[PDB]
Amino acid sequence: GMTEYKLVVVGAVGVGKSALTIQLIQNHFVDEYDPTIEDSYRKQVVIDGETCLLDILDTAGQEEYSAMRDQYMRTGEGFLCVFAINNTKSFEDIHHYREQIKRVKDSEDVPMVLVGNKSDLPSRTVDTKQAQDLARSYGIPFIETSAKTRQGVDDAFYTLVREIRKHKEK
Ligand SMILES: Nc1nc2c(ncn2[C@@H]2O[C@H](COP(=O)(O)OP(=O)(O)O)[C@@H](O)[C@H]2O)c(=O)[nH]1
Ligand SMILES: O=C(Nc1ccc2[nH]c(Cc3c[nH]c4ccccc34)nc2c1)[C@@H]1CCCN1
Ligand SMILES: [Mg+2]
């Protein structure tokens, strides 16, 4: 089978995890998607000449059992850590996501990309510099996106795949 990349989108409720995933998979912006729904989506794509499958888990937070959370973190190869540029709390939550994923996988080298969503809004509480400062400390890429206009979306997911490749080659 073609190579499959298991990607996990995490982040506080309302940041745009679902909008981002649906924009990537289906090429349209969904204004309203039930915040409590969590599912996986698939799309066959070509990244740097490689035909591959993206298998993406659109997370929604607490699970029936915490074991389910741990299971998808061990299963996931790469993680989009999403905050919204007008939601400071969501940006502060990144610390917890970074920590928890590393903790569950028991690894210091987990492919991640920092994603600042809703870049189409002039309303902003989190400056680019402040997110760059965090990304720098993590040694991971940072990309500002808009699920609304699609700006940065392919870049976000494709960069995460490229981070997975760099991890695999070690
Ligand atoms: N303006 C703007 N709104 C967005 C963007 N992404 C998501 N939203 C809106 O933010 C709200 C929550 O998005 P959603 O995908 O459900 O967030 P999630 O809970 O993290 O999946 C919805 O009303 C979306 O329409 C974006 O890039 N720009
Ligand atoms: O399916 C759900 N949740 C859920 C929870 C954990 C899951 N793990 C997987 C396996 C998977 C598919 N693609 C992935 C990419 C990264 C990590 C895990 C997966 N599906 C999952 C679906 C809920 C229940 C009713 C309908 N939505
Ligand atoms: Mg959602």
mmCIF file of C-alpha atoms and ligand atoms in Angstrom:
data_model
loop_
_atom_site.group_PDB
_atom_site.id
_atom_site.type_symbol
_atom_site.label_atom_id
_atom_site.label_comp_id
_atom_site.label_asym_id
_atom_site.label_seq_id
_atom_site.Cartn_x
_atom_site.Cartn_y
_atom_site.Cartn_z
ATOM 1 C CA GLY A 1 0.000 0.000 0.000
ATOM 2 C CA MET A 2 1.045 3.621 -0.459
ATOM 3 C CA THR A 3 2.526 5.232 2.652
ATOM 4 C CA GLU A 4 -0.081 6.402 5.157
ATOM 5 C CA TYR A 5 0.564 9.299 7.526
ATOM 6 C CA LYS A 6 -1.477 9.306 10.725
ATOM 7 C CA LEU A 7 -2.025 12.923 11.726
ATOM 8 C CA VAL A 8 -3.735 14.235 14.846
ATOM 9 C CA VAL A 9 -5.226 17.722 15.131
ATOM 10 C CA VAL A 10 -5.351 18.953 18.746
ATOM 11 C CA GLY A 11 -6.285 22.241 20.400
ATOM 12 C CA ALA A 12 -8.856 23.993 22.589
ATOM 13 C CA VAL A 13 -12.497 23.917 21.549
ATOM 14 C CA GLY A 14 -13.382 26.621 19.019
ATOM 15 C CA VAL A 15 -9.905 27.096 17.530
ATOM 16 C CA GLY A 16 -10.756 25.628 14.126
ATOM 17 C CA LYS A 17 -9.623 21.998 14.224
ATOM 18 C CA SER A 18 -12.691 20.799 12.304
ATOM 19 C CA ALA A 19 -12.727 23.742 9.900
ATOM 20 C CA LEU A 20 -9.052 23.118 9.121
ATOM 21 C CA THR A 21 -9.541 19.387 8.561
ATOM 22 C CA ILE A 22 -12.617 19.825 6.362
ATOM 23 C CA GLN A 23 -10.939 22.599 4.375
ATOM 24 C CA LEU A 24 -8.014 20.247 3.764
ATOM 25 C CA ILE A 25 -10.121 17.201 2.890
ATOM 26 C CA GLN A 26 -13.119 18.708 1.101
ATOM 27 C CA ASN A 27 -11.917 22.164 0.005
ATOM 28 C CA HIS A 28 -14.701 24.164 1.639
ATOM 29 C CA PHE A 29 -15.200 26.192 4.818
ATOM 30 C CA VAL A 30 -17.772 24.932 7.318
ATOM 31 C CA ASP A 31 -19.078 27.741 9.544
ATOM 32 C CA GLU A 32 -20.624 25.469 12.104
ATOM 33 C CA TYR A 33 -19.580 21.969 13.006
ATOM 34 C CA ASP A 34 -20.723 20.373 16.265
ATOM 35 C CA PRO A 35 -17.844 21.039 18.688
ATOM 36 C CA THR A 36 -18.367 17.651 20.373
ATOM 37 C CA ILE A 37 -17.916 15.435 17.300
ATOM 38 C CA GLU A 38 -14.598 13.612 16.902
ATOM 39 C CA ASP A 39 -13.777 11.524 13.824
ATOM 40 C CA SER A 40 -11.043 10.522 11.401
ATOM 41 C CA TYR A 41 -10.882 11.578 7.744
ATOM 42 C CA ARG A 42 -8.783 10.309 4.834
ATOM 43 C CA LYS A 43 -7.439 11.891 1.660
ATOM 44 C CA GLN A 44 -5.049 10.619 -1.004
ATOM 45 C CA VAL A 45 -2.564 13.342 -1.927
ATOM 46 C CA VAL A 46 0.773 14.049 -3.572
ATOM 47 C CA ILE A 47 3.443 15.623 -1.389
ATOM 48 C CA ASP A 48 6.835 16.399 -2.944
ATOM 49 C CA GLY A 49 6.150 13.798 -5.627
ATOM 50 C CA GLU A 50 5.094 11.073 -3.203
ATOM 51 C CA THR A 51 1.583 9.676 -3.572
ATOM 52 C CA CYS A 52 0.408 8.988 -0.039
ATOM 53 C CA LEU A 53 -2.603 8.795 2.249
ATOM 54 C CA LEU A 54 -3.321 11.333 4.966
ATOM 55 C CA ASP A 55 -5.249 9.733 7.832
ATOM 56 C CA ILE A 56 -6.352 12.567 10.082
ATOM 57 C CA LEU A 57 -7.961 12.464 13.510
ATOM 58 C CA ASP A 58 -10.050 15.563 14.217
ATOM 59 C CA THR A 59 -10.049 15.521 18.029
ATOM 60 C CA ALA A 60 -12.650 17.116 20.291
ATOM 61 C CA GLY A 61 -11.164 16.788 23.769
ATOM 62 C CA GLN A 62 -12.193 14.541 26.653
ATOM 63 C CA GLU A 63 -12.956 10.925 25.799
ATOM 64 C CA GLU A 64 -15.277 8.419 27.464
ATOM 65 C CA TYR A 65 -12.109 6.858 28.877
ATOM 66 C CA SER A 66 -8.730 8.585 29.184
ATOM 67 C CA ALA A 67 -7.262 5.399 27.679
ATOM 68 C CA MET A 68 -8.782 6.444 24.344
ATOM 69 C CA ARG A 69 -6.841 9.712 24.472
ATOM 70 C CA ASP A 70 -3.595 7.878 25.249
ATOM 71 C CA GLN A 71 -4.330 5.379 22.468
ATOM 72 C CA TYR A 72 -4.612 8.010 19.730
ATOM 73 C CA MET A 73 -1.491 9.801 20.943
ATOM 74 C CA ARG A 74 0.541 6.588 20.732
ATOM 75 C CA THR A 75 -1.034 5.772 17.358
ATOM 76 C CA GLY A 76 -0.605 9.259 15.880
ATOM 77 C CA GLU A 77 2.660 9.946 14.047
ATOM 78 C CA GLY A 78 2.411 13.727 13.912
ATOM 79 C CA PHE A 79 0.374 16.401 15.662
ATOM 80 C CA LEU A 80 -0.996 19.753 14.560
ATOM 81 C CA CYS A 81 -1.105 21.882 17.707
ATOM 82 C CA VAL A 82 -3.729 24.498 16.931
ATOM 83 C CA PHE A 83 -4.540 27.757 18.697
ATOM 84 C CA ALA A 84 -6.594 30.727 17.512
ATOM 85 C CA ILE A 85 -4.857 34.088 17.113
ATOM 86 C CA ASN A 86 -7.692 35.817 18.984
ATOM 87 C CA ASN A 87 -7.804 33.303 21.850
ATOM 88 C CA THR A 88 -4.952 33.721 24.347
ATOM 89 C CA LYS A 89 -6.154 30.804 26.478
ATOM 90 C CA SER A 90 -5.959 28.473 23.463
ATOM 91 C CA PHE A 91 -2.357 29.589 22.937
ATOM 92 C CA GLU A 92 -1.545 28.971 26.602
ATOM 93 C CA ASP A 93 -3.099 25.502 26.242
ATOM 94 C CA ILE A 94 -0.346 24.607 23.747
ATOM 95 C CA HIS A 95 2.070 23.983 26.630
ATOM 96 C CA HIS A 96 -0.223 21.258 27.959
ATOM 97 C CA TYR A 97 -0.690 19.610 24.554
ATOM 98 C CA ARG A 98 3.053 19.631 23.876
ATOM 99 C CA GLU A 99 3.724 18.071 27.266
ATOM 100 C CA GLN A 100 0.937 15.473 27.250
ATOM 101 C CA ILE A 101 1.744 14.127 23.779
ATOM 102 C CA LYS A 102 5.458 13.753 24.608
ATOM 103 C CA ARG A 103 4.492 12.164 27.921
ATOM 104 C CA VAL A 104 2.143 9.548 26.441
ATOM 105 C CA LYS A 105 4.483 8.661 23.577
ATOM 106 C CA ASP A 106 7.386 8.726 26.056
ATOM 107 C CA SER A 107 9.452 10.513 23.428
ATOM 108 C CA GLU A 108 11.519 13.688 23.090
ATOM 109 C CA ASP A 109 11.163 13.639 19.316
ATOM 110 C CA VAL A 110 7.518 13.880 18.289
ATOM 111 C CA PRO A 111 6.683 15.477 14.911
ATOM 112 C CA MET A 112 4.585 18.570 15.629
ATOM 113 C CA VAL A 113 3.657 21.810 13.918
ATOM 114 C CA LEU A 114 2.401 24.898 15.749
ATOM 115 C CA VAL A 115 -0.671 26.319 14.017
ATOM 116 C CA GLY A 116 -2.156 29.768 14.592
ATOM 117 C CA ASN A 117 -5.603 29.676 13.020
ATOM 118 C CA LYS A 118 -8.114 32.391 12.036
ATOM 119 C CA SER A 119 -5.414 34.600 10.515
ATOM 120 C CA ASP A 120 -8.107 36.237 8.377
ATOM 121 C CA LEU A 121 -9.405 38.092 11.443
ATOM 122 C CA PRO A 122 -7.788 41.445 12.269
ATOM 123 C CA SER A 123 -8.948 40.815 15.850
ATOM 124 C CA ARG A 124 -5.880 39.349 17.534
ATOM 125 C CA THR A 125 -4.530 38.728 21.039
ATOM 126 C CA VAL A 126 -1.588 36.512 20.075
ATOM 127 C CA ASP A 127 1.144 38.201 18.044
ATOM 128 C CA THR A 128 3.155 36.345 15.417
ATOM 129 C CA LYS A 129 6.324 37.073 17.423
ATOM 130 C CA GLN A 130 4.934 35.396 20.536
ATOM 131 C CA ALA A 131 4.054 32.214 18.633
ATOM 132 C CA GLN A 132 7.422 32.279 16.853
ATOM 133 C CA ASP A 133 9.072 32.508 20.276
ATOM 134 C CA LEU A 134 7.221 29.379 21.399
ATOM 135 C CA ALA A 135 7.895 27.458 18.185
ATOM 136 C CA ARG A 136 11.579 28.379 18.452
ATOM 137 C CA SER A 137 11.700 26.943 21.982
ATOM 138 C CA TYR A 138 10.128 23.713 20.732
ATOM 139 C CA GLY A 139 12.237 23.517 17.588
ATOM 140 C CA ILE A 140 9.142 22.988 15.438
ATOM 141 C CA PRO A 141 7.627 24.854 12.480
ATOM 142 C CA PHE A 142 4.972 27.526 13.055
ATOM 143 C CA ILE A 143 2.375 28.412 10.431
ATOM 144 C CA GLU A 144 -0.487 30.903 10.596
ATOM 145 C CA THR A 145 -3.586 29.643 8.809
ATOM 146 C CA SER A 146 -7.114 30.543 7.824
ATOM 147 C CA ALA A 147 -9.550 27.661 7.406
ATOM 148 C CA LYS A 148 -11.879 30.312 5.988
ATOM 149 C CA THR A 149 -9.675 31.482 3.097
ATOM 150 C CA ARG A 150 -7.602 28.257 2.990
ATOM 151 C CA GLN A 151 -4.374 30.245 3.433
ATOM 152 C CA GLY A 152 -1.689 28.080 5.043
ATOM 153 C CA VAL A 153 -3.829 24.930 5.209
ATOM 154 C CA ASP A 154 -1.961 22.609 2.845
ATOM 155 C CA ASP A 155 1.282 24.044 4.221
ATOM 156 C CA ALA A 156 0.239 23.100 7.760
ATOM 157 C CA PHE A 157 -0.580 19.466 6.995
ATOM 158 C CA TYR A 158 2.178 18.982 4.402
ATOM 159 C CA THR A 159 4.809 20.459 6.729
ATOM 160 C CA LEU A 160 3.698 17.994 9.404
ATOM 161 C CA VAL A 161 4.209 15.112 6.962
ATOM 162 C CA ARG A 162 7.681 16.445 6.131
ATOM 163 C CA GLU A 163 8.432 16.527 9.876
ATOM 164 C CA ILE A 164 7.346 12.894 10.115
ATOM 165 C CA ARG A 165 9.680 11.969 7.254
ATOM 166 C CA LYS A 166 12.606 13.694 8.977
ATOM 167 C CA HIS A 167 11.824 11.725 12.135
ATOM 168 C CA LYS A 168 11.601 8.402 10.281
ATOM 169 C CA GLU A 169 14.978 8.756 8.554
ATOM 170 C CA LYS A 170 16.944 8.809 11.817
HETATM 171 N N1 LIG B 1 -12.903 33.642 10.710
HETATM 172 C C1 LIG B 1 -12.500 32.359 10.865
HETATM 173 N N2 LIG B 1 -13.298 31.526 11.574
HETATM 174 C C2 LIG B 1 -12.948 30.232 11.757
HETATM 175 C C3 LIG B 1 -11.694 29.730 11.183
HETATM 176 N N3 LIG B 1 -11.610 28.427 11.523
HETATM 177 C C4 LIG B 1 -12.715 28.129 12.258
HETATM 178 N N4 LIG B 1 -13.511 29.208 12.379
HETATM 179 C C5 LIG B 1 -14.790 29.316 13.108
HETATM 180 O O1 LIG B 1 -14.558 29.075 14.497
HETATM 181 C C6 LIG B 1 -15.641 28.324 15.048
HETATM 182 C C7 LIG B 1 -15.111 27.012 15.605
HETATM 183 O O2 LIG B 1 -14.463 26.281 14.560
HETATM 184 P P1 LIG B 1 -14.305 24.688 14.713
HETATM 185 O O3 LIG B 1 -13.667 24.085 13.487
HETATM 186 O O4 LIG B 1 -15.628 24.041 15.049
HETATM 187 O O5 LIG B 1 -13.282 24.643 15.947
HETATM 188 P P2 LIG B 1 -12.873 23.281 16.675
HETATM 189 O O6 LIG B 1 -13.784 23.005 17.846
HETATM 190 O O7 LIG B 1 -11.449 23.414 17.147
HETATM 191 O O8 LIG B 1 -12.951 22.204 15.634
HETATM 192 C C8 LIG B 1 -16.607 28.059 13.912
HETATM 193 O O9 LIG B 1 -17.645 29.038 13.959
HETATM 194 C C9 LIG B 1 -15.796 28.274 12.656
HETATM 195 O O10 LIG B 1 -16.607 28.742 11.578
HETATM 196 C C10 LIG B 1 -10.878 30.705 10.421
HETATM 197 O O11 LIG B 1 -9.795 30.363 9.899
HETATM 198 N N5 LIG B 1 -11.338 31.960 10.311
HETATM 199 O O1 LIG B 2 -15.189 7.797 16.429
HETATM 200 C C1 LIG B 2 -15.220 8.541 17.400
HETATM 201 N N1 LIG B 2 -14.044 8.853 18.199
HETATM 202 C C2 LIG B 2 -12.699 8.304 17.985
HETATM 203 C C3 LIG B 2 -11.743 8.244 19.087
HETATM 204 C C4 LIG B 2 -10.391 7.685 18.887
HETATM 205 C C5 LIG B 2 -9.981 7.140 17.495
HETATM 206 N N2 LIG B 2 -8.821 6.574 17.036
HETATM 207 C C6 LIG B 2 -8.997 6.266 15.698
HETATM 208 C C7 LIG B 2 -7.980 5.617 14.786
HETATM 209 C C8 LIG B 2 -7.394 6.603 13.817
HETATM 210 C C9 LIG B 2 -7.806 6.823 12.502
HETATM 211 N N3 LIG B 2 -6.996 7.811 11.959
HETATM 212 C C10 LIG B 2 -6.079 8.199 12.936
HETATM 213 C C11 LIG B 2 -4.943 9.240 12.929
HETATM 214 C C12 LIG B 2 -4.123 9.433 14.142
HETATM 215 C C13 LIG B 2 -4.378 8.647 15.343
HETATM 216 C C14 LIG B 2 -5.470 7.651 15.349
HETATM 217 C C15 LIG B 2 -6.325 7.452 14.082
HETATM 218 N N4 LIG B 2 -10.273 6.640 15.341
HETATM 219 C C16 LIG B 2 -10.881 7.183 16.446
HETATM 220 C C17 LIG B 2 -12.295 7.774 16.656
HETATM 221 C C18 LIG B 2 -16.542 9.176 17.784
HETATM 222 C C19 LIG B 2 -17.445 8.160 18.396
HETATM 223 C C20 LIG B 2 -18.759 8.340 17.724
HETATM 224 C C21 LIG B 2 -18.431 8.989 16.427
HETATM 225 N N5 LIG B 2 -17.264 9.790 16.670
HETATM 226 MG MG MG B 3 -14.420 20.219 16.070
#
